[PDB]
Structures are given as structure tokens and as C-alpha cells.
From a paper:
The crystal structure of full-length SaFapR in complex with malonyl-CoA, determined at 1.9 Å resolution, revealed a different, more compact conformation of the repressor. Most notably, the two amphipatic linker helices αL, instead of interacting with each other as in the DNA-bound repressor, now bind to either side of the central dimeric EBD. This results in a protein conformation with the two helix-turn-helix domains far apart from each other, corresponding to an incompetent DNA-binding state. The phosphopantetheine and malonyl groups of malonyl-CoA are well defined in the electron density map. The phosphopantetheine group binds within a tunnel at the interface between the two protomers in the SaFapR homodimer, and adopts the same conformation as observed in many acyl-CoA-binding proteins displaying the hot-dog fold. This binding mode results in the complete occlusion of the ligand malonate from the bulk solvent. The charged carboxylate group of malonate is neutralized through a salt bridge with the guanidinium side-chain of Arg110, and makes additional hydrogen bonding interactions with the main-chain nitrogen from Gly111 and the side-chain of Asn119′ from the second protomer. The engagement of Arg110 in malonyl-CoA-binding triggers a local reorganization of hydrogen-bonding interactions and surface reshaping that further stabilize the loop connecting αL to the first β-strand of the hot-dog fold in the non-productive conformation, thus preventing DNA binding. On the other hand, the adenosine 3′-phosphate moiety of malonyl-CoA is largely exposed to the solvent (it is partially disordered in one of the two protomers) and makes no specific contacts with the protein. This implies that SaFapR specifically recognizes the malonyl-phosphopantetheine moiety of the ligand, in agreement with the observation that either malonyl-CoA or malonyl-acyl carrier protein (malonyl-ACP) can indistinctly function as effector molecules.
Residue numbers in the entry:
A (entry chain A): 7 to 189
B (entry chain B): 52 to 189
């Protein structure tokens, strides 16, 4: 009971620091079964990872004004408008070359491009220019986490840098010059 | 000669027979010209699936997908992967537009083809991109 409570405190802290941590990762860290971790989360009222993602994205779509959920590519997991945003995208068979399992370049671009749009709190946002690098192959069943950050803003454009990752590996980089209008 | 739409699909069909880097099901648009390692063209009908529904403006990843597939199809190598690309959205493409993309090889190294893409709606230049395409024979 006493070991459990200390572990449960430690799990609350893990989730606070890293909201999108998996049960497997938690199982490793605390040397208990995935079953124990689920039960721990249940006592703590912390939903399973996919539910946490759905819940937070729902809240995020409420904060943006430049693009609608139905047209957004991936799940918007973090947004600080005009500053920083992140999305995740699961790569399914619909997103790859079937023979190699390699993700299509337009898929990674769509995720990054959509994220730069959602990040900017303006009614009109249009991509003007983009420079991108496909650093490592993204594969079937990978989850891509894209991070976008505003690096400059003028009267007519936001300049945004995007870096996208599979686990800890940088797989894609893009610089986006985004046109906006307050009308 | 069959109907206009049929003919285009047949020219596309016969064009996918001279390429080896990508297949019909994975190619965005219709491949209307291919001169391997030199030049290719494709056309793409912009339907409601490809636009922002509120404004009718084509999604940038759609125009990019056309241009990107076209560059792949152009290069007559077993392995072809986009390494880098730099693109410009010059004019809004709209619902019901047909975009004609033209890809031209401008340079070639041991490891990459450098390809320039220009996309048009009728006579208007709407999109431009430079694509650095990795290739391998093996
Ligand atoms: C371009 C790169 C291969 C360059 O990496 P390196 O410098 O290590 O490459 P290299 O010259 O040593 O060549 C090794 C690569 O050749 C290819 N290769 C080698 N032998 C092969 C074989 N028997 N069968 C198939 N492919 C083979 C593999 O990709 C291999 O990568 P390895 O050694 O790693 O196995 C890589 O940086 C990369 O994959 N970047 C990501 C590219 C990408 O995913 N582009 C977007 C999707 S394609 C796209 O955008 C087009 C579209 O969607 O239409
Ligand atoms: C960025 C531009 C508006 C800049 O044009 P100008 O330099 O002529 O613009 P300007 O400063 O005179 O301002 C005119 C514009 O103000 C506002 C209206 O959009 C109006 O467009 P008007 O000139 O019509 O009156 C234009 O080049 C353009 O529309 N480019 C196409 C952008 C685009 O379609 N991006 C891809 C889709 S969006 C995208 O990629 C995001 C996504 O899909 O998620």
C-alpha cells in the first residue's frame, strides 16, 4: 500500500511532465506490470493514452481560429497560439508506398503545413513559401511528432520552423513562410 | 480515338509503362507526358476533396503531392526519394481548376537529380518548386 502510493505520486509527476508517456514506458520505469500501471492510472483518474490525446485535441481545436478540425492533418496535442504547437500523426498503409513501407513526402509535409496554419491565430493564413528536408525515412506504423515554432513575424508573414520526430529521431525539417491577414 | 477523358487515361496508362520509380495507384494526377530523366507533365483536377471548404482554396499539400509524384516518376531509377524541396505558392488554386505541373531535370550528380517544377492553371503560373531527388540503382 505504501509502495503503491509513492509509485502513484511518481506517476502523477510523469504525466505532468510528459503528458503523452505510454504505459510500457511507465511499466519499465517503475518495474511493475502494465496491468499495475493501468490500475495506478485508474486510481489517479488518468485516462489511457489515446483518450488523453482525443481529450486534449478537442480542447486545442477550440483555441485555434485559422483551420477547422475536419481539415487538420493529425491530432493537435499542444498549441500556444502565435508561439508553438505540436501534432502527432500515425502512419498507416494509406500514407506509404505499399512496396517499401516508406511514408509519402506529401504526408509529412501535410502534417507540418497544417500545424503551421493552426499555430497562427488569424482568420486568413496561407502558406507562401516552404523549404523542407526529408532527413530519415518515416515508416509504416511510425508515429510522427511535429513541433512548430514561430521564429519571426512581420505585418504580412509569420516565419515558422518545424521539426518532426519519430521517437527521439529527427526525420524531417521545414521552414515555412506563412501569409496572413487579419480579415 | 475514344472520348477525351478516356484518351487522357490511356496516355497516362501507357506512360506508367515507361516509368519504374512509382505506380499508377501512388501517382497524384494523370501523367500526360514522360520523357525519362528529362521532362514530365501531369494534370490534376481540383475537386472538393482537395480544398478548404470555406474558401475553395486548394490545400498546399495537394499541389505539393502533384509536384512531388511527378519528380519521382520522371527519374528512371529503381530507388528515388525526395531529399529536399523548396517551393512557392504564387497564386491561389481554386475548386474546379485543373493544375498542369511540368517537371524538368536541371542538374544531376552521382547521388541526386535536381528538378524544377512549374505548375499552371491555364496560362497562369501558380506554383514553383526545386526538388533535390536522391536516387540509387541498387
Ligand atoms: C536520401 C537518403 C537515402 C540518404 O541517406 P544516405 O546518405 O545514408 O544514403 P546512401 O547514398 O548511403 O544510400 C543508401 C540508401 O539507398 C537505398 N537503397 C540501398 N540499397 C537498397 C535496396 N537493395 N533496395 C532498396 N533501396 C536501397 C536506401 O534508401 C538506402 O538507405 P538506408 O541505407 O538508410 O537503408 C536518406 O537520407 C533518406 O532516406 N532520407 C529520407 C528520404 C524520404 O523519406 N523522402 C520522402 C519520401 S519519398 C517522397 O517524398 C516521394 C513521394 O512521396 O512521391
Ligand atoms: C500570399 C499571396 C496572398 C501574396 O500575394 P500579394 O503579395 O499579391 O498579396 P497582398 O500583400 O497584395 O495581399 C492580398 C491578399 O490579402 C488578403 C487576401 O488573401 C488577398 O489575396 P488576393 O491577392 O487574392 O486579393 C499570394 O501569393 C497567394 O495567394 N499565394 C497562394 C497561397 C496559397 O494558395 N497557398 C497554398 C494553400 S494554403 C496552405 O497550403 C495551408 C494548408 O493547406 O494547410
Amino acid at each position: 500500500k505504501l509502495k503503491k502510493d509513492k509509485r502513484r505520486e511518481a506517476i502523477r509527476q510523469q504525466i505532468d511532465s510528459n503528458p503523452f508517456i505510454t504505459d510500457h514506458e511507465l511499466s519499465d520505469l517503475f518495474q511493475v506490470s502494465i496491468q499495475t500501471i493501468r490500475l495506478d492510472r485508474t486510481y489517479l483518474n488518468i485516462p489511457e493514452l489515446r483518450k488523453r490525446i482525443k481529450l486534449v485535441a478537442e480542447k486545442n481545436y477550440d483555441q485555434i481560429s485559422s483551420i477547422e478540425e475536419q481539415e487538420f492533418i493529425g491530432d493537435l496535442i499542444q498549441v500556444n497560439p502565435n508561439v508553438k504547437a505540436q501534432s502527432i500523426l500515425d502512419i498507416t498503409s494509406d500514407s506509404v508506398f505499399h512496396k517499401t513501407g516508406i511514408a509519402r513526402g506529401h504526408v509529412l509535409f501535410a502534417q507540418a503545413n497544417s500545424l503551421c496554419v493552426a499555430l497562427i491565430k488569424q482568420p486568413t493564413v496561407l502558406t507562401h513559401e516552404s523549404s523542407i528536408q526529408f532527413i530519415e525515412k518515416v515508416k509504416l506504423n511510425d508515429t510522427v511528432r511535429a513541433e512548430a515554432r514561430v521564429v519571426n513575424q512581420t505585418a504580412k508573414h509569420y516565419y515558422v520552423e518545424v521539426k518532426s520526430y519519430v521517437k527521439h529521431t529527427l526525420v524531417f525539417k521545414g521552414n515555412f513562410k506563412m501569409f496572413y491577414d487579419k480579415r
